[PDB]
Amino acid sequence: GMTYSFDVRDNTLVVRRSTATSGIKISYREDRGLLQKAVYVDKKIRKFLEEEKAVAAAIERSVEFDNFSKEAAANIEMAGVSNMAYNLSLFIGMVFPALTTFFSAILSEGEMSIWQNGQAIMRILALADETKLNVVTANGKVKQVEVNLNDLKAAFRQSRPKRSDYRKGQGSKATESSISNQCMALIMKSVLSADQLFAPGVKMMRTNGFNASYTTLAEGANIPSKYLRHMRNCGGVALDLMGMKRIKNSKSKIFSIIQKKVRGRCRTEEQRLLTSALKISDGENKFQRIMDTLCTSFLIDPPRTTKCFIPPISSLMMYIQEGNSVLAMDFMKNGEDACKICREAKLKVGVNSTFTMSVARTCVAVSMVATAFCSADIIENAVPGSERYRSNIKANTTKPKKDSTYTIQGLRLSNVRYEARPEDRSWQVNVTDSFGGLAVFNQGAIREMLVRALVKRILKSASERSARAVKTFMVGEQGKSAIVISGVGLFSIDF
Amino acid sequence: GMTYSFDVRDNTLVVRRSTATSGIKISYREDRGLLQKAVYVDKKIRKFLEEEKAVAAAIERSVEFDNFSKEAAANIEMAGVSNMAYNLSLFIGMVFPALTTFFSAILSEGEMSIWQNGQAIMRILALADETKLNVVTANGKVKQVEVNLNDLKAAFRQSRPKRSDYRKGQGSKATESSISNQCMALIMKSVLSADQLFAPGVKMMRTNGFNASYTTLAEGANIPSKYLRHMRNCGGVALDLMGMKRIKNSKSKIFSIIQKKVRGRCRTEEQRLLTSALKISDGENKFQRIMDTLCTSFLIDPPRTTKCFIPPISSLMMYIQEGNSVLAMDFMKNGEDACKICREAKLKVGVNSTFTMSVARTCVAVSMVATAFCSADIIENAVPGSERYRSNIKANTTKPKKDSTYTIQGLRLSNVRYEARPEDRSWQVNVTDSFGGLAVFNQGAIREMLVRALVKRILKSASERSARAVKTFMVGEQGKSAIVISGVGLFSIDF
């Protein structure tokens, strides 16, 4: 050793040692003992930097990441009218009042109408179902209240629908716990999707050796495994694939189990064959070639995805507290009932310089469609006025930090909208900028105007499909309106 | 003959004759004498339908088209700090006050602050420079005032800057008339670009045998030829190409003149060669192949385009009437000074069920960037709240119809923005819809993840370029903000 410092080799922060003599040699000591002489800050260094001696933000995101990754790493190992709608409405109609009642001991009325607090209630609920403190937004100010998780758990287990209350198909093995878990998976998918706005999972994909572009395949990666086990398709295909790659290196039987699950999630035949084409007895290359091809295909043709469309938690609690009934509602088919609750209740939110109103509106939008990876155009039409670029967002999290301060104002959600479930003859194939100097154009259209067999087909099919602009309808109570899904999303500007 | 009716064969309305006998034979009589027994309604049929006996809309658009096409057909035949900035500001600073004064005889003060009326003033001015009635918006209601065009012409010719007033390069042949015409071309490009929102020119391209997709190459086609002659590049390359095709069929010398102009408008070498490759001595095919290739290339790499960035006409008149000076302003380099005037003046507009506020905002946006073919993202950021889809627009024209009624309210233009003149490392290459069922994706990226030589190169270059998302900055006084040009524009939903 001779000289010590802190640096960022890749996207992590490491200890850099320079020794001079036969000139200068550079070492990155992974000892992390040393730390005195000196995005991801890591545990030992964050404990030493917090104990003794931008720095606070990249560490809040870092420990957050640690939690996300632990939850994801639970889920990757575990890889080895409609009933569901009626059950989910029954579940909500029975559980939410019990949540209203429990938290009336702890929170005021106005407090439960604050967006952050609904989120907080579900997170603590999920925690109990698996005495802690709980960070609550007050009069712009953050208070820490105490929640007894046994009371919360017991209240939940008794309040929730019974096995006989649910509609189950004939000879169903489904139990009370089982269905509860399905509902919690559907609801946790919505609540947690706002976090993936702030930390999509890029780091995790990179750390597992997947191209960052495959992050869009990691929706809901942090849904608590007890719930996802029952509702695998709430989870996003990247979980299974990473499980398959990890077990490819390292037993044989598991690989077949995950493979079968992935095959079932495929919605085109091309992906099904491609999936089966992966074999535990292949070289590193050409298994990676197949895996990569498969991943890429999944960007073209998404895996089978399950989810629900519910209004904000607080809104939902208010709407039920006001006397309204959700038993006859359908949150599976589309977002209509979710929008009806949205327009009706008078949700409130805490906002500030970093977590602005347009940020909050984006967080709502994202939970309504239960995915951070949704088209930005859709997001914008779903909750008007929301922010369409992640880059313009200055906050680093949805969660109040206890030193946090807000101004509590109204989160009006009339003019909210949902996408019609589907069941473009335009001539305009390019635009210019303001100067008429630069053009953006539809590649597929421009091209028309002018194992290996698999790849060729997929590539042709892709181009054949990208040539036509994709349109979709946003539905209000006043009617229905076409928009174009451009392909731009959140995260489209880095970073 | 046996039976007669009206029908729409292609996109025009024709007279359909059925004769039955040896069964039934169908004829489309082009006589148009006959009309009693019975989108483009045509003259003789519109005169007969108006004189004797949805119908009114498709005919307002039809006669409008006739005017557009006549003006375009003048321009296609005629195909055979900075000075310009300072001259344009001088021109405006001297001409606009004279317009304020002239129209004070005819209009009230409040009337001149109405958007429609500024448009009307320039159109009549252009007319005079080439006693009529003039349709004016009043108190929501439309009045017809009388304008004496000789007075208007004389006032203009005397008020406008003199040859010595302008900055001209050494040994310039430029005259007073000459420069006036350059300025009128720049200003008419802005004022008239709102019409191309309503009638882009699809019909004209189709009628000349060009693919409708090439409509984006027809910006400013209806700019009065006396002005465009001096400022060809305000006009859009389709004018020259159509001239070249028309003369290809039909003298030799003209073809070379237009060819030279087109060659000069090219900004890539590929287009220059391609342009020169067109020869009057080629077969129908393979001249069309080259022409088409050239047209397509122009969608990828726009021709040289000139234009100015000015605020709405009325705004401009008000700002000058209020005492402010534009002599030191630059409307060529970008839209900064235009936005400064926008924020300052208190423009008003007449609006109604069809011509709504969001429609009016779109009409303003389009004139600010002086093109109907600009990116929708840009339009939306340029004048917030404007309508991003032509399809959602119910009006058929910017012009009050004399039977028209409005509610006159304020057209606030703070928060307006301009695109920084340029001098994306994102991992997100696809989005999903709300259901996670359908994906939209970047073709170029997906492909990377997985005479004839010319064509091949162009096609490769296209794909190479479309792979990376294009970003640009919108500038406010509070700062600068990145957006992505998605490729979606106005007209992206048909029809």
Author numbering:
A (entry chain A), B (entry chain A): 5 to 25, 27 to 38, 41 to 45, 61 to 75, 86 to 112, 133 to 182, 201 to 320, 325 to 497, ...
What text does the study give?
The genome of orthomyxoviruses consists of multiple segments of negative-sense, single-stranded RNA molecules, each packaged in the form of rod-shaped, double-helical ribonucleoprotein (RNP) complexes. Our study of a fish orthomyxovirus, the infectious salmon anemia virus (ISAV), shows that its nucleoprotein (NP), which forms the protein scaffold backbone of the viral RNP, has a bi-lobular structure like the influenza virus NP. Each RNP contains a viral RNA, a heterotrimeric viral polymerase (consisting of PA, PB1, and PB2) and multiple copies of the viral-encoded nucleoprotein (NP) that bind viral RNA in a stoichiometric manner.
Without the last 16 residues, the ISAV-NP ΔC16 mutant also formed dimers, similar to the full-length protein, and produced crystals that diffracted far better up to 2.7 Å resolution. While the N-terminal domain is made up of a single polypeptide stretch containing the first 111 residues, the head and body domains are not colinear, with the head domain made from two excursions of the polypeptide chain (residues 272–380 and 494–558) out of the body domain. Structural comparison shows that the head and body domains of ISAV-NP closely resemble those of the influenza A virus NP, despite the lack of significant sequence similarity. Although there is only one NP in each crystallographic asymmetric unit, dimers are found around the crystallographic two-fold symmetry axes, which are presumably the same as those found in the solution. The tail loop of ISAV-NP (residues 504–530) folds into an extended β-hairpin that protrudes into a deep pocket in a neighboring subunit to mediate dimer formation. Analogous to the influenza A virus NP, there is a potential RNA-binding groove between the head and body domains of the ISAV-NP.
